[PDB]
PDB file of C-alpha atoms and ligand atoms in Angstrom:
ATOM      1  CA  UNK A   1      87.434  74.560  51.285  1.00  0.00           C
ATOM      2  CA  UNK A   2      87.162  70.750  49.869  1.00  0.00           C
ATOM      3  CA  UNK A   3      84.752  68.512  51.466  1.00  0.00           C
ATOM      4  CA  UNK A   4      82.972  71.160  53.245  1.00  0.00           C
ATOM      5  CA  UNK A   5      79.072  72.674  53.052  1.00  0.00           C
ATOM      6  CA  UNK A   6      78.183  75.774  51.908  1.00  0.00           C
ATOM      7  CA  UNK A   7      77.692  77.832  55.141  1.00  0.00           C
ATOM      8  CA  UNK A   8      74.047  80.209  54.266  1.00  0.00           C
ATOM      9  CA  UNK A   9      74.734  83.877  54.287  1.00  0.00           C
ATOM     10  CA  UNK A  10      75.729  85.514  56.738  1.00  0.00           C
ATOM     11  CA  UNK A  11      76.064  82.698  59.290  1.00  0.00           C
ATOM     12  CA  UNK A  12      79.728  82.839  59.669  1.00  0.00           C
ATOM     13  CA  UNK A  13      79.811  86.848  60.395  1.00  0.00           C
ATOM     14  CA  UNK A  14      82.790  87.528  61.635  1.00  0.00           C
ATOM     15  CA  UNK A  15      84.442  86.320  58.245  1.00  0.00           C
ATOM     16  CA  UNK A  16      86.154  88.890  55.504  1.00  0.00           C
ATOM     17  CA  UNK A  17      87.234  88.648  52.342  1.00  0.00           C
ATOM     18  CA  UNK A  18      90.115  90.986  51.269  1.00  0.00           C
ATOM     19  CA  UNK A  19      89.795  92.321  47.868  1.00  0.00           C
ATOM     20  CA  UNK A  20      92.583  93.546  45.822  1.00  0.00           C
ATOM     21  CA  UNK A  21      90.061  94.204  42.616  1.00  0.00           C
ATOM     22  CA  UNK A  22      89.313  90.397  43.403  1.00  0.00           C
ATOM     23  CA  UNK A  23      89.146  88.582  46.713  1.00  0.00           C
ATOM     24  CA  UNK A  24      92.880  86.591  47.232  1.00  0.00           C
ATOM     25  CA  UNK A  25      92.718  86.271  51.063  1.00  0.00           C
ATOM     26  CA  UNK A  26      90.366  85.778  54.140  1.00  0.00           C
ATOM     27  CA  UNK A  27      90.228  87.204  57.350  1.00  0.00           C
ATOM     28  CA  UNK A  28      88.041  87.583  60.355  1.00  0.00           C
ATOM     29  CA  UNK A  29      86.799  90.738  62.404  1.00  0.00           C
ATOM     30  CA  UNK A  30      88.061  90.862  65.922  1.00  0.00           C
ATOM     31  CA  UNK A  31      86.513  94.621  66.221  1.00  0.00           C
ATOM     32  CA  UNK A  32      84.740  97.436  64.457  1.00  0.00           C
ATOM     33  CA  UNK A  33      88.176  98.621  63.081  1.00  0.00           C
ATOM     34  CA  UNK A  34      90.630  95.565  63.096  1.00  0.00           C
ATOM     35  CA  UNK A  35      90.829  92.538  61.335  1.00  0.00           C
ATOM     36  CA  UNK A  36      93.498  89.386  61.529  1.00  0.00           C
ATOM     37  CA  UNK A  37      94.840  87.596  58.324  1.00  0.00           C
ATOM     38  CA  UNK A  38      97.609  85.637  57.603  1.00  0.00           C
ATOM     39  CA  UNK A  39     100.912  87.753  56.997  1.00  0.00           C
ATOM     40  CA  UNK A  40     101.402  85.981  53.623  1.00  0.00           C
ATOM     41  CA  UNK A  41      98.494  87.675  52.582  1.00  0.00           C
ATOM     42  CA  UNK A  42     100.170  90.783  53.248  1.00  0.00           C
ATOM     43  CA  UNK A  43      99.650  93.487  50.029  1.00  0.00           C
ATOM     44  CA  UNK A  44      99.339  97.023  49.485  1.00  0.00           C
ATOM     45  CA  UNK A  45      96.016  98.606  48.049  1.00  0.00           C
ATOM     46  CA  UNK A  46      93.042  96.085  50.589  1.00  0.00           C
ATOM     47  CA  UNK A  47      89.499  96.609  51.142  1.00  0.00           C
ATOM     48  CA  UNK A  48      87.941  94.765  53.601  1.00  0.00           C
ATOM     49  CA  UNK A  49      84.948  93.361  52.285  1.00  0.00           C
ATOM     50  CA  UNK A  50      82.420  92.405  55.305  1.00  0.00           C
ATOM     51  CA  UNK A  51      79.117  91.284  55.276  1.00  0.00           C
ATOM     52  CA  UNK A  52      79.871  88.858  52.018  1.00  0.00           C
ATOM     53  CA  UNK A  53      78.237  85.407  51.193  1.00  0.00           C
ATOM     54  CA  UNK A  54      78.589  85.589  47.184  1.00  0.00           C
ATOM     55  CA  UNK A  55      81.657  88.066  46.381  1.00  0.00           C
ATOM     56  CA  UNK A  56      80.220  87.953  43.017  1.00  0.00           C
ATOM     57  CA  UNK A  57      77.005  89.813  44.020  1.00  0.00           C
ATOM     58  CA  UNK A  58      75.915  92.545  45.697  1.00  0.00           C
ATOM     59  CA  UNK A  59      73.016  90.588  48.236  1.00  0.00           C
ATOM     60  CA  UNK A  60      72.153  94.044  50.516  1.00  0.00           C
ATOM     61  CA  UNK A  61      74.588  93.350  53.651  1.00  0.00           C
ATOM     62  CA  UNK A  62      77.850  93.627  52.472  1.00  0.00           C
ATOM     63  CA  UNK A  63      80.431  96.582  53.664  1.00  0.00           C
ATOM     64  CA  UNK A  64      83.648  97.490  51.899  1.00  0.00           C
ATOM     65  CA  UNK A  65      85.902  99.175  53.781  1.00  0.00           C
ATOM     66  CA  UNK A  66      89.923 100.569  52.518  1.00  0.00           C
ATOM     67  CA  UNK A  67      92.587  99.266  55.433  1.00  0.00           C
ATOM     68  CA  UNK A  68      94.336 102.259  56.759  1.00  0.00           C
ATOM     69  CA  UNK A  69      97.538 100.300  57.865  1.00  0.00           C
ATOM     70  CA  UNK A  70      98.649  97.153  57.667  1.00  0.00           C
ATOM     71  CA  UNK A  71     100.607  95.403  60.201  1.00  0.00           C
ATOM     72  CA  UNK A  72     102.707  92.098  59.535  1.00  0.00           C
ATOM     73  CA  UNK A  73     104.016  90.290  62.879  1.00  0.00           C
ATOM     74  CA  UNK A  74     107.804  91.414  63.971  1.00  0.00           C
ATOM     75  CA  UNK A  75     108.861  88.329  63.456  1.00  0.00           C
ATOM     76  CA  UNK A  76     107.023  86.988  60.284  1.00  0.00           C
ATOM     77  CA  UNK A  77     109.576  84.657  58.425  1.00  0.00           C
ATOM     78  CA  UNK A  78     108.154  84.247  54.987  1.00  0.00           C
ATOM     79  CA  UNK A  79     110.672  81.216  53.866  1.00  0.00           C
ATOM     80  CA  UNK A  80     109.198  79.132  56.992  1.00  0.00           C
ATOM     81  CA  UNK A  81     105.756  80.361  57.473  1.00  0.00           C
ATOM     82  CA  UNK A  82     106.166  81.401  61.286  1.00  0.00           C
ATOM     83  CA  UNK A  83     104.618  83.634  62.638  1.00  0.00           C
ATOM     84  CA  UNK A  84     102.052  84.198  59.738  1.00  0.00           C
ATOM     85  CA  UNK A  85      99.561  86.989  61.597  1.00  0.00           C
ATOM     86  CA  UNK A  86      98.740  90.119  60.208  1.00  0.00           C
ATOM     87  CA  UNK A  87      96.784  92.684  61.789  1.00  0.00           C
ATOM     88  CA  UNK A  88      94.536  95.290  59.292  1.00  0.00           C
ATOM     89  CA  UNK A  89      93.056  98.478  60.646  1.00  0.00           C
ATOM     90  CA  UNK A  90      90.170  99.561  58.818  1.00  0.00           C
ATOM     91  CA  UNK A  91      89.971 103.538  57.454  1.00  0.00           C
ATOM     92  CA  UNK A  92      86.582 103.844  59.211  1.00  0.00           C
ATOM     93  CA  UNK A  93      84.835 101.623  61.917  1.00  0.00           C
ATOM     94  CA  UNK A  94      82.322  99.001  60.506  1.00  0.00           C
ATOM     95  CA  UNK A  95      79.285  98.955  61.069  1.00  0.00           C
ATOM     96  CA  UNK A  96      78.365  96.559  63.774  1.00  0.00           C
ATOM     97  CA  UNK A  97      74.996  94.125  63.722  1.00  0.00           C
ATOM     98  CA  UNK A  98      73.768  90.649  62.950  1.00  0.00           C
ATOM     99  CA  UNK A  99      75.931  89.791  59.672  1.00  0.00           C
ATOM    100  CA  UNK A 100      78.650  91.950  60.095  1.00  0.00           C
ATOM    101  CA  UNK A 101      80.088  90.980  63.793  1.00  0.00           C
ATOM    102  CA  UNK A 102      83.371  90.312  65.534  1.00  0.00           C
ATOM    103  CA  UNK A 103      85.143  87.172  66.748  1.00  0.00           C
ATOM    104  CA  UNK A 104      86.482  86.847  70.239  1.00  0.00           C
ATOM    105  CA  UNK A 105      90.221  86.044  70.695  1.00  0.00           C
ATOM    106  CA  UNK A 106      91.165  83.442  72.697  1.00  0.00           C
ATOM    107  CA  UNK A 107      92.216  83.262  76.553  1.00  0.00           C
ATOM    108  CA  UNK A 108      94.416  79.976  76.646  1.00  0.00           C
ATOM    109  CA  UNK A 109      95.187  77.523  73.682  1.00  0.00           C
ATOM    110  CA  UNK A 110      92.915  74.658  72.397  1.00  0.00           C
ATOM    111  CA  UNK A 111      93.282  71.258  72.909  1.00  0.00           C
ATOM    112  CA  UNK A 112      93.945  68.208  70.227  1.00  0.00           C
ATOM    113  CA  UNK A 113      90.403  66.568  69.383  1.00  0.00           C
ATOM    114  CA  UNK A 114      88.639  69.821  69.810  1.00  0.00           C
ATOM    115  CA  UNK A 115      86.321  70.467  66.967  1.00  0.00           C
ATOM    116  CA  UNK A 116      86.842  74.105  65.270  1.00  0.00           C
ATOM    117  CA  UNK A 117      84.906  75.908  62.014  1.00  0.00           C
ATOM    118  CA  UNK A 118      86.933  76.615  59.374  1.00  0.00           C
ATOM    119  CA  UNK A 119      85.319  78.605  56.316  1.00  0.00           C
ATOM    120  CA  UNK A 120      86.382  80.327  53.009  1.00  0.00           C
ATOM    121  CA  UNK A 121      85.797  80.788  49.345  1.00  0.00           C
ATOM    122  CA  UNK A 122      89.291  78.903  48.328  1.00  0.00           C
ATOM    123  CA  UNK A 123      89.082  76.081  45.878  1.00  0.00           C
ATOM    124  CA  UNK A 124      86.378  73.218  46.419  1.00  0.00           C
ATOM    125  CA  UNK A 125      88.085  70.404  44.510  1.00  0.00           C
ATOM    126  CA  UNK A 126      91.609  68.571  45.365  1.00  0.00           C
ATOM    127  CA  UNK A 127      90.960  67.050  41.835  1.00  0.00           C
ATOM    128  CA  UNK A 128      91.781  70.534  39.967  1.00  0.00           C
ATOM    129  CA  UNK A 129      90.246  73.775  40.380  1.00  0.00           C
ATOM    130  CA  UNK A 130      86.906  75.477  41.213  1.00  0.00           C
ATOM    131  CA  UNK A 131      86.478  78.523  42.860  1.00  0.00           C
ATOM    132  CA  UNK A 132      83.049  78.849  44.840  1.00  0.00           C
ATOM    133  CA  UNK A 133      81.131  82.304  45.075  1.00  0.00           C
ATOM    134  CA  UNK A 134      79.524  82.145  48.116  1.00  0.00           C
ATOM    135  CA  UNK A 135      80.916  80.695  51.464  1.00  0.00           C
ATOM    136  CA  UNK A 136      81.834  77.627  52.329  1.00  0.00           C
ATOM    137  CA  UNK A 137      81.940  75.827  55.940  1.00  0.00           C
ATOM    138  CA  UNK A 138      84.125  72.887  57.059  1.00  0.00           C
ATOM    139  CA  UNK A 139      83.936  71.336  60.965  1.00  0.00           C
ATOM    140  CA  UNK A 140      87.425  69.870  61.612  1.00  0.00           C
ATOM    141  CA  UNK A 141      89.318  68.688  64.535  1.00  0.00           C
ATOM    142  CA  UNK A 142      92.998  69.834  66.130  1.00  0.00           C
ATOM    143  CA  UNK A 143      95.248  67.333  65.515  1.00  0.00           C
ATOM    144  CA  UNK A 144      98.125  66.550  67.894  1.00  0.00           C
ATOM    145  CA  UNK A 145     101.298  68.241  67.735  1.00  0.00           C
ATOM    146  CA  UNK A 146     103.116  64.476  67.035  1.00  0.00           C
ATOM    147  CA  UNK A 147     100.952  63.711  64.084  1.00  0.00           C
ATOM    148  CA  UNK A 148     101.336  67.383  62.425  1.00  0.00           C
ATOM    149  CA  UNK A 149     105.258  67.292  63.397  1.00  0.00           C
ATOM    150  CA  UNK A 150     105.289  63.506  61.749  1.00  0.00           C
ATOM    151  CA  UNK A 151     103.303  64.993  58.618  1.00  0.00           C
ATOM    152  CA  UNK A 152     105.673  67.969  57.820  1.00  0.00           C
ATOM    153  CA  UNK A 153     108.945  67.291  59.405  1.00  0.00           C
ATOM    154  CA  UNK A 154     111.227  69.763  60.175  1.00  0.00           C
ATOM    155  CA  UNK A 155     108.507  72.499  59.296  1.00  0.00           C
ATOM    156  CA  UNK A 156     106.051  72.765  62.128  1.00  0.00           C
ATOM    157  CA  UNK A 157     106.625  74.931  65.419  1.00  0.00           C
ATOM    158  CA  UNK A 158     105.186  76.195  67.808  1.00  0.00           C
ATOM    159  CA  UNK A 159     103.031  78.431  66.542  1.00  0.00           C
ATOM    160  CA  UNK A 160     101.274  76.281  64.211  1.00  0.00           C
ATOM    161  CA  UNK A 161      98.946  73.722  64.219  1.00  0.00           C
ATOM    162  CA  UNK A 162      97.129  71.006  62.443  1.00  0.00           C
ATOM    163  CA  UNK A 163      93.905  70.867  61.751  1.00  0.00           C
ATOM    164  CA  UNK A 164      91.586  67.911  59.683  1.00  0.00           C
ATOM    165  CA  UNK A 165      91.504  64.687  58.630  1.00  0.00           C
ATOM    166  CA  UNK A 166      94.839  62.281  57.902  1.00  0.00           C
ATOM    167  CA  UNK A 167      92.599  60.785  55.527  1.00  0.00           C
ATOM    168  CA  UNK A 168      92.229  63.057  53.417  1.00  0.00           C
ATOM    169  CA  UNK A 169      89.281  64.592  51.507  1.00  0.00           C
ATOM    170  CA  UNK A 170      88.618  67.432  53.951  1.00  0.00           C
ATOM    171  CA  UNK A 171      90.594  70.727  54.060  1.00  0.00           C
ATOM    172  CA  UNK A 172      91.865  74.207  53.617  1.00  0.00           C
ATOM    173  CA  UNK A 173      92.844  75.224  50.223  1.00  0.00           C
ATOM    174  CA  UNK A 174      94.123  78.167  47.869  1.00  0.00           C
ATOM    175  CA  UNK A 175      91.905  81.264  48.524  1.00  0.00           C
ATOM    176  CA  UNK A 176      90.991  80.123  51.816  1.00  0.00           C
ATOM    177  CA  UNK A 177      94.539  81.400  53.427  1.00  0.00           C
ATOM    178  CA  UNK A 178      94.010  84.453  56.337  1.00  0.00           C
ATOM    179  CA  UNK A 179      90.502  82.910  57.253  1.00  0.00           C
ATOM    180  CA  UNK A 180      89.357  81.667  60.545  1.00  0.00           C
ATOM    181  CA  UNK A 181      90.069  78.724  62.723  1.00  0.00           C
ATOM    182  CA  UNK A 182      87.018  79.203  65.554  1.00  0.00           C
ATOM    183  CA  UNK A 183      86.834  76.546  68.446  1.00  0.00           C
ATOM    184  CA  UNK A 184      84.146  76.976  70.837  1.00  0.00           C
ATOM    185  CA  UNK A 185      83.725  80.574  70.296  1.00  0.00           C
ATOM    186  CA  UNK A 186      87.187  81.483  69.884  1.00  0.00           C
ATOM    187  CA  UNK A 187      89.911  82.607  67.387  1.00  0.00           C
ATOM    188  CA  UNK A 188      92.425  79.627  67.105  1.00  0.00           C
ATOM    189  CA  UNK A 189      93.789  79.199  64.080  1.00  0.00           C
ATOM    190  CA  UNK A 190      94.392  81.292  60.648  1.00  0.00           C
ATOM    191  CA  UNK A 191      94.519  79.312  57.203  1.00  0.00           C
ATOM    192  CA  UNK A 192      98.150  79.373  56.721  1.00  0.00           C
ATOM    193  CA  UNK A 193      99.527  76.736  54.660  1.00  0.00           C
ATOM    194  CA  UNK A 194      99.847  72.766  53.949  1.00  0.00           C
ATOM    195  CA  UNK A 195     101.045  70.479  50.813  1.00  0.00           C
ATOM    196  CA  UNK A 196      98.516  70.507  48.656  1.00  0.00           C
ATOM    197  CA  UNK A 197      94.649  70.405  49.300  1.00  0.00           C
ATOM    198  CA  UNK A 198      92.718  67.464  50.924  1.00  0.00           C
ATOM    199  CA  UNK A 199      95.652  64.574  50.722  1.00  0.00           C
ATOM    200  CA  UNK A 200      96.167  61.638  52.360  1.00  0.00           C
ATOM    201  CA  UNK A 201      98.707  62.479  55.292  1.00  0.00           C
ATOM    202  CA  UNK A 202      99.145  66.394  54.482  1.00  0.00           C
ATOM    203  CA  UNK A 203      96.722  68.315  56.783  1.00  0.00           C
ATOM    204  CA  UNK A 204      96.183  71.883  57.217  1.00  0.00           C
ATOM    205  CA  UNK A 205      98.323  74.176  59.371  1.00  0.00           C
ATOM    206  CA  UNK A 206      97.475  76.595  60.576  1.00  0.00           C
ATOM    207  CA  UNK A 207      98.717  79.978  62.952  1.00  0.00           C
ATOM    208  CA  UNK A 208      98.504  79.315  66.557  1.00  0.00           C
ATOM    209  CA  UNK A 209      96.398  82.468  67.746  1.00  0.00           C
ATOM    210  CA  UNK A 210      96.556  82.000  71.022  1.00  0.00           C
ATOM    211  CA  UNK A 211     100.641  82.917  71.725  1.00  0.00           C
ATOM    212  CA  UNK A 212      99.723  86.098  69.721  1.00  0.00           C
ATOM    213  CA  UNK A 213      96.885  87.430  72.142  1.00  0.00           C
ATOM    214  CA  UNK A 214      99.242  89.493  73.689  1.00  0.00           C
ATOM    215  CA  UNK A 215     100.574  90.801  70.756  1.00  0.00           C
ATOM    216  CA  UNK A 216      97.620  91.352  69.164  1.00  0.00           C
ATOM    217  CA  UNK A 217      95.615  92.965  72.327  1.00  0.00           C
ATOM    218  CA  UNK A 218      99.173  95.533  72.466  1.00  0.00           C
ATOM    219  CA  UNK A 219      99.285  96.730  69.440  1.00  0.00           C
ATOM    220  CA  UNK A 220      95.329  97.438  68.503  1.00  0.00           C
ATOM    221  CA  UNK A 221      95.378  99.269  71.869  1.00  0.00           C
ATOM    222  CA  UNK A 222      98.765 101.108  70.667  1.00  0.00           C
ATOM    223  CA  UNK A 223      97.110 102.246  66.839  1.00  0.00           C
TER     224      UNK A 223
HETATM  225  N1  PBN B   1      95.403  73.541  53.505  1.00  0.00           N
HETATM  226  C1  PBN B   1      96.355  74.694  53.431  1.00  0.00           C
HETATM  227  C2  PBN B   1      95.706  75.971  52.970  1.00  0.00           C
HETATM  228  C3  PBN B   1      96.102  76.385  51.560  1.00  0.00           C
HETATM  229  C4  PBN B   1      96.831  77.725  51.638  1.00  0.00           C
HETATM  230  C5  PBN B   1      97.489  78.176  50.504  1.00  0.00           C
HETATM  231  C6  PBN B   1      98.039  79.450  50.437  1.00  0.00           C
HETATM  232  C7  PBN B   1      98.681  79.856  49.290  1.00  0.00           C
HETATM  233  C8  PBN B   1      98.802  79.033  48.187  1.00  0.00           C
HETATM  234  C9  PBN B   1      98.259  77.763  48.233  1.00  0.00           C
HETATM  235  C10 PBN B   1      97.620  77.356  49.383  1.00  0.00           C
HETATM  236 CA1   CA B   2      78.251  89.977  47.900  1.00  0.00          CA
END
């Protein structure tokens, strides 16, 4: 995250960190035994690491958990970036309470202007690289479809979105990919991709959660 706050542990609960001997993705906890990430996040050997503010020390409320199975969307198309969901069941069911909790999943779309939380422990600086330890925060609005389309052409459908600040100086970056996207209590968006971090004219887009309720909802009841 550049230009964002560090969030205070444990206030963004429903957020994971996936640890491969290192943490390399987020993710966020929709139940006790499921968690969505981005499909380019996609490896064998996770644990799920809930309950985490710094992954570099063990604070008293942290959970790690092996995934069982791994499931990358049908139609995941890792040249383009569509359809970049991935859903992770854990081995065994978390343990559910005040910093380990899930996220609900959307019922219709959001809206352009509406203000969402996006959070992770990717790089802090557009002017190199520095990797924080504990979590950090950033409130950004939906952009419209024309400005993300006029950002990236040829590249955005419609299951992404922007998200951010045409300015600049306020984004997703590297590290933060498979996190969370919440608007107004809901699961919108997953860290996905951009051009770079925090530049003029190159926003964040992210997966458009809301046209995979349907899919997701199917196949956790299905596994
Ligand atoms: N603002 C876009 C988020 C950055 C995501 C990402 C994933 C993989 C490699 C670099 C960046
Ligand atoms: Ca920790």
């Amino acid at each position: 995250i550049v230009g964002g706050y560090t969030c205070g542990a444990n206030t963004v609960p429903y957020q994971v960190s996936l640890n491969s001997g290192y943490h390399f993705c987020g993710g966020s906890l929709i139940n006790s035994q499921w968690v969505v990430s981005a499909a380019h996040c996609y490896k064998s050997g996770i644990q799920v690491r809930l309950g985490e503010d710094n992954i570099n020390v063990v604070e008293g409320n942290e959970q790690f958990i092996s995934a069982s199975k791994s499931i990358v969307h049908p139609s995941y198309n890792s040249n383009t970036l569509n359809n970049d969901i991935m859903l992770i069941k854990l081995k065994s069911a978390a343990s559910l309470n005040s910093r380990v909790a899930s996220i609900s999943l959307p019922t219709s779309c959001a809206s352009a202007g509406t203000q969402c939380l996006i959070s992770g422990w990717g790089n802090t600086k557009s002017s190199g690289t520095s990797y924080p330890d504990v979590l950090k925060c950033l409130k950004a609005p939906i952009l419209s479809d024309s400005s993300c389309k006029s950002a990236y052409p040829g590249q955005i459908t419609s299951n992404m979105f922007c998200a951010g600040y045409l300015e600049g100086g306020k984004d997703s970056c590297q590290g933060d990919s498979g996190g969370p996207v919440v608007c107004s209590g809901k699961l919108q968006g997953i860290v996905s991709w951009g051009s770079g971090c925090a530049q003029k004219n190159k926003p964040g887009v992210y997966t458009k959660v809301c046209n995979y309720v349907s899919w997701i909802k199917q196949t956790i009841a299905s596994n």
